Design a protein around this motif. Structure first.
Motif, PDB file in Angstrom:
ATOM      1  N   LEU A 144       0.837  -1.226   0.000  1.00 58.16           N
ATOM      2  CA  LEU A 144       0.000   0.000   0.000  1.00 58.16           C
ATOM      3  C   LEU A 144       0.865   1.266   0.000  1.00 58.16           C
ATOM      4  CD1 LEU A 144      -2.773  -1.341   2.340  1.00 58.16           C
ATOM      5  CD2 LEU A 144      -3.132  -0.523   0.007  1.00 58.16           C
ATOM      6  N   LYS A 145       2.069   1.249   0.576  1.00 57.55           N
ATOM      7  CA  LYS A 145       2.941   2.457   0.578  1.00 57.55           C
ATOM      8  C   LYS A 145       3.358   2.768  -0.869  1.00 57.55           C
ATOM      9  CE  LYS A 145       7.408   0.225   1.659  1.00 57.55           C
ATOM     10  NZ  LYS A 145       8.254  -0.171   2.812  1.00 57.55           N
ATOM     11  N   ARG A 146       3.622   1.743  -1.682  1.00 62.16           N
ATOM     12  CA  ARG A 146       3.972   1.909  -3.119  1.00 62.16           C
ATOM     13  C   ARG A 146       2.719   2.279  -3.926  1.00 62.16           C
ATOM     14  NH1 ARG A 146       7.161  -2.883  -1.792  1.00 62.16           N
ATOM     15  NH2 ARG A 146       9.301  -2.147  -1.438  1.00 62.16           N
ATOM     16  N   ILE A 147       1.575   1.656  -3.643  1.00 57.76           N
ATOM     17  CA  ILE A 147       0.318   1.915  -4.408  1.00 57.76           C
ATOM     18  C   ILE A 147      -0.103   3.368  -4.147  1.00 57.76           C
ATOM     19  CG2 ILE A 147      -2.111   1.294  -4.687  1.00 57.76           C
ATOM     20  CD1 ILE A 147      -1.100  -1.597  -3.658  1.00 57.76           C
ATOM     21  N   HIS A 148       0.102   3.854  -2.921  1.00 61.36           N
ATOM     22  CA  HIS A 148      -0.150   5.269  -2.538  1.00 61.36           C
ATOM     23  C   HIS A 148       0.783   6.200  -3.328  1.00 61.36           C
ATOM     24  CE1 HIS A 148       0.658   8.899  -0.145  1.00 61.36           C
ATOM     25  NE2 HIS A 148      -0.686   8.949  -0.154  1.00 61.36           N
ATOM     26  N   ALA A 149       2.090   5.915  -3.339  1.00 64.25           N
ATOM     27  CA  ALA A 149       3.130   6.708  -4.036  1.00 64.25           C
ATOM     28  C   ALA A 149       2.779   6.835  -5.526  1.00 64.25           C
ATOM     29  CB  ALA A 149       4.485   6.071  -3.848  1.00 64.25           C
ATOM     30  N   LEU A 150       2.290   5.754  -6.151  1.00 61.75           N
ATOM     31  CA  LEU A 150       1.909   5.740  -7.590  1.00 61.75           C
ATOM     32  C   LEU A 150       0.620   6.540  -7.821  1.00 61.75           C
ATOM     33  CD1 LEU A 150       2.831   2.026  -8.151  1.00 61.75           C
ATOM     34  CD2 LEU A 150       3.868   3.939  -9.387  1.00 61.75           C
ATOM     35  N   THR A 151      -0.460   6.262  -7.092  1.00 61.77           N
ATOM     36  CA  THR A 151      -1.816   6.778  -7.433  1.00 61.77           C
ATOM     37  C   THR A 151      -1.997   8.244  -7.003  1.00 61.77           C
ATOM     38  OG1 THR A 151      -2.865   5.854  -5.456  1.00 61.77           O
ATOM     39  CG2 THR A 151      -2.836   4.465  -7.428  1.00 61.77           C
ATOM     40  N   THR A 152      -1.128   8.801  -6.152  1.00 58.64           N
ATOM     41  CA  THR A 152      -1.203  10.234  -5.742  1.00 58.64           C
ATOM     42  C   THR A 152      -0.447  11.143  -6.720  1.00 58.64           C
ATOM     43  OG1 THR A 152       0.602   9.885  -4.158  1.00 58.64           O
ATOM     44  CG2 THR A 152      -1.595   9.920  -3.248  1.00 58.64           C
ATOM     45  N   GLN A 153       0.295  10.612  -7.700  1.00 60.78           N
ATOM     46  CA  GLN A 153       1.222  11.433  -8.533  1.00 60.78           C
ATOM     47  C   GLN A 153       0.541  11.823  -9.848  1.00 60.78           C
ATOM     48  OE1 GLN A 153       4.901   9.527  -9.633  1.00 60.78           O
ATOM     49  NE2 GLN A 153       3.887   7.691 -10.421  1.00 60.78           N
ATOM     50  N   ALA A 154      -0.569  11.168 -10.187  1.00 59.33           N
ATOM     51  CA  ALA A 154      -1.419  11.484 -11.357  1.00 59.33           C
ATOM     52  C   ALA A 154      -2.804  10.868 -11.140  1.00 59.33           C
ATOM     53  CB  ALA A 154      -0.767  10.970 -12.618  1.00 59.33           C
ATOM     54  N   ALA A 155      -3.712  11.068 -12.094  1.00 57.31           N
ATOM     55  CA  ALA A 155      -5.051  10.441 -12.142  1.00 57.31           C
ATOM     56  C   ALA A 155      -4.915   9.079 -12.825  1.00 57.31           C
ATOM     57  CB  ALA A 155      -6.014  11.332 -12.890  1.00 57.31           C
ATOM     58  N   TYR A 156      -5.091   7.991 -12.077  1.00 53.95           N
ATOM     59  CA  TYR A 156      -4.959   6.603 -12.587  1.00 53.95           C
ATOM     60  C   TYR A 156      -6.340   5.971 -12.782  1.00 53.95           C
ATOM     61  CZ  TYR A 156       0.101   6.702 -11.999  1.00 53.95           C
ATOM     62  OH  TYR A 156       1.426   7.020 -12.101  1.00 53.95           O
ATOM     63  N   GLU A 157      -6.408   5.098 -13.783  1.00 54.80           N
ATOM     64  CA  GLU A 157      -7.483   4.102 -13.994  1.00 54.80           C
ATOM     65  C   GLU A 157      -6.989   2.756 -13.455  1.00 54.80           C
ATOM     66  OE1 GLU A 157      -8.298   3.489 -18.211  1.00 54.80           O
ATOM     67  OE2 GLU A 157      -6.192   3.940 -18.749  1.00 54.80           O
ATOM     68  N   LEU A 158      -7.924   1.878 -13.097  1.00 56.65           N
ATOM     69  CA  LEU A 158      -7.638   0.508 -12.616  1.00 56.65           C
ATOM     70  C   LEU A 158      -8.174  -0.493 -13.641  1.00 56.65           C
ATOM     71  CD1 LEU A 158      -6.892  -1.528 -10.264  1.00 56.65           C
ATOM     72  CD2 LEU A 158      -9.273  -1.214  -9.526  1.00 56.65           C
ATOM     73  N   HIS A 159      -7.367  -1.500 -13.961  1.00 60.95           N
ATOM     74  CA  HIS A 159      -7.773  -2.688 -14.748  1.00 60.95           C
ATOM     75  C   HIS A 159      -7.641  -3.929 -13.868  1.00 60.95           C
ATOM     76  CE1 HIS A 159      -8.548  -4.547 -18.763  1.00 60.95           C
ATOM     77  NE2 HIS A 159      -7.990  -5.599 -18.145  1.00 60.95           N
ATOM     78  N   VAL A 160      -8.713  -4.719 -13.778  1.00 65.91           N
ATOM     79  CA  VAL A 160      -8.732  -6.036 -13.082  1.00 65.91           C
ATOM     80  C   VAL A 160      -8.970  -7.121 -14.135  1.00 65.91           C
ATOM     81  CG1 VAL A 160      -9.756  -7.374 -11.190  1.00 65.91           C
ATOM     82  CG2 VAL A 160      -9.718  -4.877 -11.057  1.00 65.91           C
ATOM     83  N   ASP A 161      -7.987  -8.003 -14.335  1.00 67.05           N
ATOM     84  CA  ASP A 161      -8.116  -9.224 -15.176  1.00 67.05           C
ATOM     85  C   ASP A 161      -8.394 -10.420 -14.264  1.00 67.05           C
ATOM     86  OD1 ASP A 161      -7.770  -8.295 -17.922  1.00 67.05           O
ATOM     87  OD2 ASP A 161      -5.647  -7.982 -17.404  1.00 67.05           O
ATOM     88  N   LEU A 162      -9.408 -11.215 -14.618  1.00 62.03           N
ATOM     89  CA  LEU A 162      -9.870 -12.403 -13.859  1.00 62.03           C
ATOM     90  C   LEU A 162      -9.905 -13.612 -14.797  1.00 62.03           C
ATOM     91  CD1 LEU A 162     -12.849 -10.656 -12.050  1.00 62.03           C
ATOM     92  CD2 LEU A 162     -10.538 -10.961 -11.182  1.00 62.03           C
ATOM     93  N   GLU A 163      -9.707 -14.803 -14.239  1.00 61.37           N
ATOM     94  CA  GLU A 163      -9.739 -16.095 -14.970  1.00 61.37           C
ATOM     95  C   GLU A 163     -10.285 -17.159 -14.015  1.00 61.37           C
ATOM     96  OE1 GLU A 163      -6.477 -18.958 -17.273  1.00 61.37           O
ATOM     97  OE2 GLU A 163      -6.003 -16.829 -16.935  1.00 61.37           O
ATOM     98  N   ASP A 164     -11.219 -17.991 -14.484  1.00 63.21           N
ATOM     99  CA  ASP A 164     -11.788 -19.128 -13.714  1.00 63.21           C
ATOM    100  C   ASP A 164     -11.026 -20.396 -14.110  1.00 63.21           C
ATOM    101  OD1 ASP A 164     -12.906 -20.148 -16.107  1.00 63.21           O
ATOM    102  OD2 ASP A 164     -14.865 -19.230 -15.692  1.00 63.21           O
ATOM    103  N   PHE A 165     -11.433 -21.562 -13.608  1.00 61.39           N
ATOM    104  CA  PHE A 165     -10.718 -22.849 -13.836  1.00 61.39           C
ATOM    105  C   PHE A 165     -11.281 -23.568 -15.070  1.00 61.39           C
ATOM    106  CE2 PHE A 165      -9.318 -21.919  -9.575  1.00 61.39           C
ATOM    107  CZ  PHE A 165      -8.022 -22.382  -9.564  1.00 61.39           C
ATOM    108  N   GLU A 166     -12.176 -22.929 -15.829  1.00 65.20           N
ATOM    109  CA  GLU A 166     -12.799 -23.498 -17.057  1.00 65.20           C
ATOM    110  C   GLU A 166     -12.424 -22.660 -18.290  1.00 65.20           C
ATOM    111  OE1 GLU A 166     -17.045 -24.147 -16.449  1.00 65.20           O
ATOM    112  OE2 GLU A 166     -16.672 -24.976 -14.427  1.00 65.20           O
ATOM    113  N   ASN A 167     -11.207 -22.101 -18.336  1.00 65.75           N
ATOM    114  CA  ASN A 167     -10.649 -21.372 -19.515  1.00 65.75           C
ATOM    115  C   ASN A 167     -11.215 -19.945 -19.604  1.00 65.75           C
ATOM    116  OD1 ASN A 167      -9.189 -23.119 -22.076  1.00 65.75           O
ATOM    117  ND2 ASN A 167      -9.513 -20.923 -22.383  1.00 65.75           N
TER     118      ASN A 167
END
Ligand SMILES: *[C@@H]1O[C@H](CO)[C@@H](O[C@@H]2O[C@H](CO)[C@@H](O[C@@H]3O[C@H](CO)[C@@H](O)[C@H](O)[C@@H]3O)[C@H](O)[C@H]2NC(C)=O)[C@H](O)[C@H]1NC(C)=O
Ligand SMILES: *[C@@H]1O[C@H](CO)[C@@H](O[C@@H]2O[C@H](CO)[C@@H](O[C@@H]3O[C@H](CO)[C@@H](O)[C@H](O)[C@@H]3O)[C@H](O)[C@H]2NC(C)=O)[C@H](O)[C@H]1NC(C)=O
Ligand SMILES: *[C@@H]1O[C@H](CO)[C@@H](O[C@@H]2O[C@H](CO)[C@@H](O[C@@H]3O[C@H](CO)[C@@H](O)[C@H](O)[C@@H]3O)[C@H](O)[C@H]2NC(C)=O)[C@H](O)[C@H]1NC(C)=O
Ligand SMILES: *[C@@H]1O[C@H](CO)[C@@H](O[C@@H]2O[C@H](CO)[C@@H](O[C@@H]3O[C@H](CO)[C@@H](O)[C@H](O)[C@@H]3O)[C@H](O)[C@H]2NC(C)=O)[C@H](O)[C@H]1NC(C)=O
Ligand SMILES: [Ca+2]
Ligand SMILES: [Ca+2]
Ligand SMILES: [Ca+2]
Ligand SMILES: [Ca+2]
Lengths: 219, 219, 219, 219
Positions: free
Chosen positions: C79-102
């Motif tokens: 969280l100390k690194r995630i704070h350092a990154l997200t306070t320095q500009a306006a960021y978007e978040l991408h979440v990639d997910l995968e199940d056990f059936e491809n």
């Protein structure tokens, strides 16, 4: 811009005694010091001053590492700062002394350093490098050469006792000292043995000096 | 590029009130502050704000050193940051106050600093330098000049008690205060003595103000 | 020279997925991250990856602050690194997910930050800013907006219990979650309720995903 | 100006063996190291030296992280520094060994790193990367590849015991070792099993070497 010590401050055109920012090689955040711009041409970085007994010098390891007091008064700059300064070039040491009868004297040491080759200077006890005495106070520091710094809560001396506890100071104690400039401010002649602000080669082991200043300049 | 405070932010062409990155001389990592770009021409770095009682100000030493709350709301920037800012130039202090009856007042101090000559500002208790009052709120800070910062868990005041515990705040307490802007958010007139958000010269010792902002600008 | 994130790395001509040095505004020492140079044009800084259950994610506050695992495998950047990154500009978040059936799915959030206005982000519990959902996984994060980060040894949630202890994870828990990507690696359908790698809008509350990656890019 | 290691020091025109300041990418304060400017063209950064048994190597986790001894003598540079150096480029390792009968041998490893992809190298136990042996001492390190660093107070080895306690050293122990260069200075042939300064492929498991130096150079 980024003077590394008080000599860089002077050579940049700042001629007034006072408080300045310096930036040692391995302490890039920098810190403030008192600069003596008068003694032997000037450019001395002060790391110790006694003048009135207003500050308690009978402090433990953390205080001697981190520093205490005020730059404009009695202070100890801190061994972590003294290490950062003396490892970045070859420094000389100047010690100014004053008794309670108007008298003054000085000791000059051609070489001075703290923890010069220590991987962890704190672990290694900020050991003293000092050589090449000249001046009027006589030599009271060469016998401390090679000794680790000892405080009341961290004994690295060559005594069966804790020299710092016994002589109510903090120093590169052997068994135990010829100098005790971080000793109690006892104000001149005292019955207690060697536990005041002592420079034995000038005023012996039972005279607590009025004033001391320890300061460094690159050679 | 690397503004040292909110005045550098303003002079670089940023005219909007809000949160900006600043980089004090001896805090090169820098940090975010709220900049007031409107008051008397703008360029004020905020270090304290009360406005709604949403944040607990009855915090210990570590919280007052490191800071707490949010820059967009009630906060304390932290004495380590206030020290880093006020030691890098000569700052003035502006205090804006507001009561619960629409009323506003201000105090201006021509000189303001925290731990200005302290070798270890934290050890030395971040002592207050403040002088040269003008404004409409009256002076409630000059008597705190020279006092160390006292919290409920670290007593450096001139009282036989802990002023911070007694007046439910954190301040450069003497014995004990004329101002208590980190006091409890008690919302206007209160029976309890001097333990609210107090500025005694304006609203006395039993009136907890609605709003306070403490902010600095180089002179 | 000194890219602030993986988008600076990409724009400097580094096109390969892998480990790179980045230097956030208020973290000048910098640190290494995994850069995704492929997803939607590339320049994503990874801060979380699950893929095989080789790393224990049921860790306390200090581990979630400082980070754990390996950049080439399962990890949490801290969280100390995630704070350092997200306070320095306006960021978007991408979440990639995968199940056990491809199967695969993603969630995009137009705004993402941790402790954005916190004077002491750690004290303030690294609170979540997240808005503006699009993608195929459905939204399982907007209800966590405004919540502090909770671990098994530091409860800041809106539950009478410790959500992190109960759901064997670490997250911006409310009462308690719609997502649990730091949950136990339980490998697909499980009888225990909501204590696996959960994204409830895609696979519900009793399905622990095979793969998750959380990553940020400036907008 | 800011050499990142001893090879930068050499290429800048400094040809003498000795102590120099280096400034790794993610350790910008920098630190002092011993540079070997002679071996195979020079530019080696020393991180370990045994030569006389003057320094205690049977130290705990904090000492192995932070370093100990003196750069001009027996020392351990510290895993935090070895991590800072080996993550900034692709390094080779050189090990120089000497017995008490005038004999010398060396091992060269084409790749060497500590905590190369660890988010928190300390948490992750500064795991060893080493490959591609050549030289005269034989290989006593490849079997330690992938192992975490183990000390007497922090067991991360593949033994039911603490290898560091058992073999009176600190190393990337498996179950337990083919090399023990941080072992006790037992001075040649000893009855105790594998608890001296051991390089098993050269002098076996009951011979404590006179001299060891471990050093790195970018390829
Ligand atoms: C003895 O010590 C003093 C410093 O303590 C050396 O300098 C002399 O210091 C005194 C007082 O500090 C000065 O005299 C006074 O000056 C003040 C204003 O600064 C004035 O208000 C008083 O009426 C008085 O005149 C003096 O200027 C200064 N120099 C001399 C020549 O006296 C002194 O050099 C030391 N050594 C000896 C051998 O006296
Ligand atoms: C008394 O305090 C207020 C600030 O609290 C000073 O400014 C006045 O603030 C009020 C409300 O904050 C404003 O009136 C309202 O404006 C909002 C939109 O911002 C509107 O929705 C409402 O219908 C209402 O009109 C007002 O603009 C603002 N200025 C004035 C001239 O009233 C005020 O100056 C303070 N001092 C005195 C002596 O009133
Ligand atoms: C389903 O998941 C896979 C990824 O797990 C998606 O891509 C396909 O991945 C498989 C195996 O990872 C690849 O097939 C194999 O390739 C390897 C060499 O990489 C070869 O040794 C095997 O004999 C086998 O041919 C495959 O190339 C890759 N792409 C395709 C078109 O199969 C896949 O797209 C996911 N989605 C669907 C709907 O299949
Ligand atoms: C065996 O080990 C030595 C190093 O310990 C290798 O070099 C030889 O080292 C010795 C003593 O360290 C040197 O001899 C002496 O030199 C000193 C002055 O440095 C002098 O005061 C003595 O009277 C004595 O002559 C010697 O110069 C040095 N080289 C040779 C050729 O002996 C030696 O190479 C190693 N290997 C073998 C196979 O001897
Ligand atoms: Ca002793
Ligand atoms: Ca008191
Ligand atoms: Ca709770
Ligand atoms: Ca074990």
């Amino acid at each position: 811009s980024r003077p590394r010590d008080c000599l860089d401050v002077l050579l940049s055109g700042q001629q007034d005694d006072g408080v300045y920012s310096v930036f040692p090689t391995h302490y890039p955040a920098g810190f403030q010091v008192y600069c003596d711009m008068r003694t032997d041409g000037g450019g001395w970085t002060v790391f110790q001053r006694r003048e009135d007994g207003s500050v308690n010098f009978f402090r433990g390891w953390d205080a001697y590492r981190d520093g205490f007091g005020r730059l404009t008064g009695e202070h100890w700059l801190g061994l972590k700062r003294i290490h950062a300064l003396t490892t970045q070039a070859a420094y000389e040491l100047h010690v100014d002394l004053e008794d309670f009868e108007n008298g003054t004297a000085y000791a000059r040491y051609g070489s001075f350093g703290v923890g010069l080759f220590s991987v962890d200077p704190e672990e290694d006890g900020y050991p003293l490098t000092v050589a090449d005495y000249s001046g009027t106070a006589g030599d009271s520091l060469l016998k401390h050469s090679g000794m680790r710094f000892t405080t009341k809560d961290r004994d690295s001396d060559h005594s069966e006792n804790n020299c710092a506890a016994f002589y109510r100071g903090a120093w590169w104690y052997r068994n135990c000292h010829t100098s005790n400039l971080n000793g109690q401010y006892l104000r001149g002649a005292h019955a207690s043995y060697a536990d005041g602000v002592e420079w034995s080669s000038w005023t012996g082991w039972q005279y607590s000096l009025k004033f001391s200043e320890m300061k460094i300049r690159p050679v």
